[PDB]
Design an enzyme around this catalytic site. Sequence first.
Site, short mmCIF file in Angstrom:
data_model
loop_
_atom_site.label_atom_id
_atom_site.label_comp_id
_atom_site.label_asym_id
_atom_site.label_seq_id
_atom_site.Cartn_x
_atom_site.Cartn_y
_atom_site.Cartn_z
CG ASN A 110 -15.52 -11.45 -22.35
OD1 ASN A 110 -14.82 -12.47 -22.39
ND2 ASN A 110 -16.11 -10.95 -23.43
CG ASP A 131 -19.24 -13.28 -20.47
OD1 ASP A 131 -18.16 -12.92 -20.99
OD2 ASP A 131 -20.35 -12.89 -20.89
CG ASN A 189 -18.49 -14.68 -24.40
OD1 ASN A 189 -19.68 -14.61 -24.06
ND2 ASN A 189 -17.51 -14.20 -23.65
CG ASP A 235 -11.96 0.93 -20.12
OD1 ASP A 235 -11.97 1.53 -21.23
OD2 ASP A 235 -11.11 0.05 -19.85
CB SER A 250 -13.67 -14.76 -24.30
OG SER A 250 -14.83 -14.31 -24.98
CD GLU A 298 -24.34 -9.58 -18.16
OE1 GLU A 298 -24.12 -10.74 -18.57
OE2 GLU A 298 -24.19 -8.58 -18.89
CG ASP A 357 -14.92 -14.28 -28.35
OD1 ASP A 357 -16.09 -13.96 -28.11
OD2 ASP A 357 -14.00 -14.21 -27.51
#
EC number: 3.2.1.17
Length: 129
Positions: free
Chosen positions: A59, A52, A46, A101, A50, A35, A48
């Site tokens: 994110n 990280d 990203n 989650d 957003s 990562e 879209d």
Amino acid sequence: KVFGRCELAAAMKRHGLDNYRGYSLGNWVCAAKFESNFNTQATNRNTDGSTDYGILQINSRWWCNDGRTPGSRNLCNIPCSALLSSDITASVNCAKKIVSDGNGMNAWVAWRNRCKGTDVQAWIRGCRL
Ligand SMILES: [Cl-]
């Protein structure tokens, strides 16, 4: 801060990630390697819009607030910039929420594509834990 491999393994160990929700330490170290290359300051935008953040590339679409990802959530209830400290506590605490989650460590694209199904134990070889 750019962590050494074993330095990070030890930090993750003392923060309780070893076998957390069944994910052995080497999975967490492998995820961080691919990562952020162990760099706490890593950020990536990203497609879209957003971003990280940090050692585990958390994110802003879902997990932290950066004030510049319209419509997004802040499920870890933390400013994204807080996930960039030399101390990994904030990222670990948020990571534990993420992994509990739904799809587990599949939430980290680099884990799914580069760690999952591989022998991750090598990531903690030789480390003082
Ligand atoms: Cl918004």
